[model samples]
Target: PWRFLDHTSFGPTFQALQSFAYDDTLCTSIGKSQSPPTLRAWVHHNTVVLGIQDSRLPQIKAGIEALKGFQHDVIVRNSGGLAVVLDSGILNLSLVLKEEKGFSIDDGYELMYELICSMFQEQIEAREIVGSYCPGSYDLSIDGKKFAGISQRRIRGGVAVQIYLCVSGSGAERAKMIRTFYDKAVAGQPTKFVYPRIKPETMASLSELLGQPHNVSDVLLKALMTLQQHGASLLTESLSADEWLLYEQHFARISERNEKLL
Candidate 1:
């Protein structure tokens, strides 16, 4: 049973650090012997999350150049999954799980996906849309068009379930951005690990999938409230001082790392 907890939001990427700070708190979570899992929703002004493979591309510098040219914040997240696009039209969700409560890493991810798909099952077809953006076995799509991607970070008996859903934009628009990333990031250079092939047609958004446009905040807030109503008791609050203190330290680390990349 999820009891006391805190909830926070990083208002769009107009300020970059807020998103990074939120990640720090969720990645390790606020210290609690057995803290209830917390869910956070974040939106970046304009950004693309590069996968581990993209970070090592022989021509990654070129890709970075493309992203810079477009004025988008690009970051290689410390989580699983490959290159996934995130922007104003996209919504990123993170659920911090305390393994002390018996939730495994896979469980943490599956739990969120299960909850999301089930909630919107009536409105949109929520299944793994293979060959779409991110092109993972875990891709969530409607009618073979992908929209959401899942990734996870496990640490110290806690796991952060993370996903970026392109809920509000043109699926093709987002795919074009990522396809551009793939083109420049790799420059058609071959590697040991086969990177995902770009398939614009394989991805679609909530609006496209549901045959109607939807606001990301609306869908996400509804899902969160549902969790509180039926899933567990969700206590809405913010990070405590110690939590903020730790988060600030982590924020510096994130900035330092990005400085090197920049």
Candidate 2:
């Protein structure tokens, strides 16, 4: 029922928006049924994926300076949500499907919730992990500590359900980075939009909370296995030339929009 695309060749820092651009391409393609439903996995090295509102933080420069030495690029993601950390240990999955009849935004969210729960046998819960960065109703947590977050993007008739799971590494460290980023970014200044009060302790990694080591590869296998059991023969076809043409156009727009963020 779906094909898989692994597009991690682009380092997490170099042109980060390219991922979103390619995703839009696939979204449109699959929406038209020009391609099959898709599952895409991506990993970026050290990077901080910020939301639109984050770029407008009152003390933005200070926040950017606080990120020094993290060896990561700070880029505003072309999607919804607030700041989230991305590193080698994080795995991003997008379940792309056609928007058929009776498809609601809630339906899209629940599908991912159910699929994630099925993969981990209920170790993951869907609830807002308060005091966590990018807090949302769909925050995925274990034992009240958040290790993952989900978001969605729709283009044409395709829905891309995306999630980022902190697989292994110091989740607290990652959280601390964002916590400091926001702390500096806000600098106690009030804004028309409310920002999160990030509490680093409320965030954790799967390896830490599970009391056993879990890496990105481990969780990825669980996701693939879950889909395999769903009885859909998977495909791994490369992008067609037409798709590439569309991707370039999308890429330009994504890059241009980000450039304006300067």
Candidate 3:
């Protein structure tokens, strides 16, 4: 059984930080067996999410400023991965489940890969797409053009596997924006960590790849149906009273952390 949290229609006041807090809250509840496995679908408008390592870039402040120049809200995420762009055109899904003993890291990544592959029902490739922003082994692509990347965060006895799918618009353009951010942040200077040299051509949105329009809502609906096909009962619900308290605490902590980056 899965609890579907439909945050896809979040209001204008909703910030990307709230999504992270909600995931952490669900993690605590699900870890304690107070909730079932959960799936959260979210969409943020014109925001850039940066990984902790991204905050260490030589000229990160300049890079952030560049993103802001395009009217995108920027925040450093509490999880792992490099920077990724988020907008209404991108659909973000977080699968939260109880972490059992003997569960390996690859297990978490593989589960998400399977779910996404089943949802699209296409011959998708899971491999690191070189020159793609936020490249990872679980990068989902078709025809060698990356479209999605997955990251995992585990706390207490729960694990949250998150991925952002480029559903519409031009993925190459987004990659170019990230590439420019890196160019400004790196300035061709040496750093302990090697940042990806993003190539806009290496990425494509589902709409571009499939030669048809694809919307976030449509993809989300497909995901729900796929879950049902997997024999999981669905329960549409929101945070409980107790979960609200935990969510606020996590929200405050994450907000304070981001404040430090400024």
In terms of lDDT, the best-performing candidate is 3
Worst 10 residues of 1 by lDDT: 1-10
TM-score of each: 0.85, 0.95, 0.97
| Model 2, span 98-161: residue lDDT tens | 9889999879999999988888875678999988989989999988999889998998888999
Two-way TM-score contest, 1 vs 3, winner: 3
Off by over 4 Å in 3: none
Worst 10 residues of 3 by lDDT: 74-83
Q: Residue by residue across 168-230, what tens digits does model 3's lDDT show?
A: 999999999999899988888886587999999999999999899999989999999999998
Model 1: per-residue Cα lDDT at residue 74: 77
Q: Give the TM-score of candidate 1.
A: 0.85
**For model 2, the run of ten residues with the poorest summed lDDT:** 7-16
lDDT of candidate 1 vs native? 0.68
Error of 3 at 210 (Å): 1.2
Residue 120, candidate 2: how far off, in angstroms?
Answer: 1.4
* Deviation from truth (RMSD, Å), model 3: 1.2
Candidate 3, residue 143: CA error in Å? 0.4
In candidate 1, which residue ranges exceed 4 Å CA deviation?
1-20, 27-31, 78-80, 122-128
Q: TM-score of model 3 relative to the true fold?
A: 0.97
